[PDB]
Structure 1
């Protein structure tokens, strides 16, 4: 019934990658290219993309919903332009998760102008567990995650109506 959205990896902390170039005409905001706000599309810096190794320990008492993604580019040339490294992965581990993602190149129809694709993943990180990310490219990294602070009866109701100001 309620999150508290918390910052788990500051966008300002990416000292070896570009963190503010991951924007797209597919995601416009107020006339400018933008992107999903809660994750960060990391881009190589000075023609290099050093291997990322970052961890976050859930020091709260509440479970945490963590979201991240991978970018599947259009061709090899785009792969190099964005990430330098031609052959890349993102590995993710917790006490239960054991994931190792690899970008897929395919030739795809444009949707919202883009033939590339972003694929998102999630996990629930229990109190006192940690999540460990490793990648040498294509990583759409967490910035914000959601602490679950209230649980209870709820439902997702499908309706075209909007608020009625009543009880």
Structure 2
């Protein structure tokens, strides 16, 4: 699945991978035992691999979700290739950045 930035400004795109609990859960969710996600931009050259360990439950879950981002320049394309464990984008974000600040911590 390719996507071309036909917009006029930069795009913040987010995707993720699912690190499952065991080979039994891998097969149940995605069939293919050995899997990958590749992501490709004019700069990005990424190939993720799900990571089976056994883990403490957090909100009932021992599986983990690991998320990744990138800025997609105007007129560049992003190319996803995955045979499993892919948390795919539906929405992305247009950004123009003319300056910086920080994050404030406040209860107000």
TM-score (norm 2): 0.95
1:58–1:156: structure 2 CA closer, same or farther, 3 Å change rule?
same
Question: Runs (4+) of structure 1 moved beyond 2 Å?
Answer: 149-155
Q: What's the CA shift string for 1:88-135, capped at 9, x where partnerless? A: 000000000000000000000000110000000000000000000000
Q: Which of structures 1 and 2 has the larger relative contact order (alpha carbons within 8 angstroms, sep 6+)? A: 2
Q: List runs of 5+ in structure 1 lacking aligned partners.
A: 1-53, 162-167
Aligned length: 108
Give 1:149 deviation, angstroms: 4.1
- Residue 153 of structure 1: CA displacement? 4.5
- Unaligned runs of 5+ residues in structure 2 are none
TM-score under structure 1 length normalisation: 0.62
**How far is the alpha carbon of 1:150 from its aligned partner?**
5.7
Deviations, residues 54-94 of structure 1 (Å, cap 9, x unaligned): 01000111000000000000000000000000000000000
Larger Rg: 1
RMSD over aligned Cα atoms: 1.1
Indicate which of 88, 94, 99 corresponds to 1:147: 94
Quickly say closer, same or farther: Cα 1:153–1:101, change in 2 above 3 A.
closer
